[PDB]
Design a protein around this ligand. Structure first.
Ligand SMILES: C[n+]1cn([C@@H]2O[C@H](COP(=O)(O)OP(=O)(O)OP(=O)(O)O)[C@@H](O)[C@H]2O)c2nc(N)[nH]c(=O)c21
Lengths: 64, 181
């Protein structure tokens, strides 16, 4: 039974020695794109990445 | 409130690059693991991650016997890979309705790419979602069997999965579990 209010969602380790980049779940969720940034204002470089993903047939979604 | 993948509401680097892999469901009795496992894409920023996960199927759409794997770049999601060969996996099997699969998977991915549950001296090499008839599974793949680091990771993983009972998380060395939490 996960909920956004779970305290794990705000946790991030501090005083790291090896890793520079760590983010809490909430920090990452705040960086979710807006509808515009995922469509009609999408960064063209991100659009190229999306266009490189497989076509739907790759996943074999009908194979039970 | 719940976290969702799709936007039905300065780049930010990740500690490592990651590659998303898929295990396809077989269409016949001839296809092997080596035929079915394919890399999909790589990413190394938060922005790239979100663009990928918003444009691939959600867990609830995936067919029986498929897997998603998200592993640090240059690590294959295989027990034979040099980086995994001395390790194992913490695995949780969601028995029952499992209506929370999409959110559980999202939370797990965020915690993995965000480096929040791994040790600073990294153990986690990747994470695997497995779609199976008896209940879908979530697994963290580790580079070692070191007990105290594994127990720290395991306790944090239980929180990510919103588990409150004991006995739900099992560690399987890549060689019946050797640790249960
Ligand atoms: C992760 N993995 C899976 N396989 C193949 O995939 C099979 C299933 O591997 P699995 O680890 O997903 O088992 P699971 O318990 O989920 O399977 P289930 O019984 O259908 O529920 C193994 O027998 C191997 O044949 C693998 N085969 C190799 N060589 N290396 C791997 O790392 C590997």
């Amino acid at each position: 039974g996960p909920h956004m209010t779970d305290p794990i969602t705000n946790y991030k380790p501090m005083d790291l020695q090896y890793k520079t980049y760590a983010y809490s779940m909430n920090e990452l969720y705040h960086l979710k794109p807006s509808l515009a940034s995922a469509s009609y204002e999408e960064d063209p470089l991100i659009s190229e990445l999306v266009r490189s993903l497989p076509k739907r047939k790759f996943w074999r979604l009908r194979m039970g | 409130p719940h976290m969702t993948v799709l936007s039905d509401s300065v780049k930010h680097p990740l500690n490592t690059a990651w590659t998303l892999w898929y295990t396809k469901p077989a269409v016949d009795k001839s296809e092997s693991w080596s035929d079915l496992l394919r890399p999909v894409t790589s990413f190394q920023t938060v922005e790239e991650f979100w663009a990928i996960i918003q444009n691939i199927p959600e867990p609830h759409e995936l067919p029986l016997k498929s897997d998603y794997h998200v592993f640090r770049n240059d690590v294959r999601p295989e027990w034979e890979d040099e980086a995994n060969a001395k390790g194992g996996k913490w695995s949780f099997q969601l028995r029952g309705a499992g209506a929370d699969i999409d959110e559980l998977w999202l939370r797990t991915l965020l915690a993995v790419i965000g480096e929040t549950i791994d040790e600073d001296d990294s153990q986690i090499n990747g994470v695997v979602l497995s779609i199976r008839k008896g209940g879908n599974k979530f697994a963290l793949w580790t580079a070692s069997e070191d007990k105290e680091p594994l127990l720290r990771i395991g306790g944090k993983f239980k929180q990510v999965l919103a588990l409150t009972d004991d006995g739900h998380l099992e560690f399987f060395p890549h060689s019946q579990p050797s640790i249960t939490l």
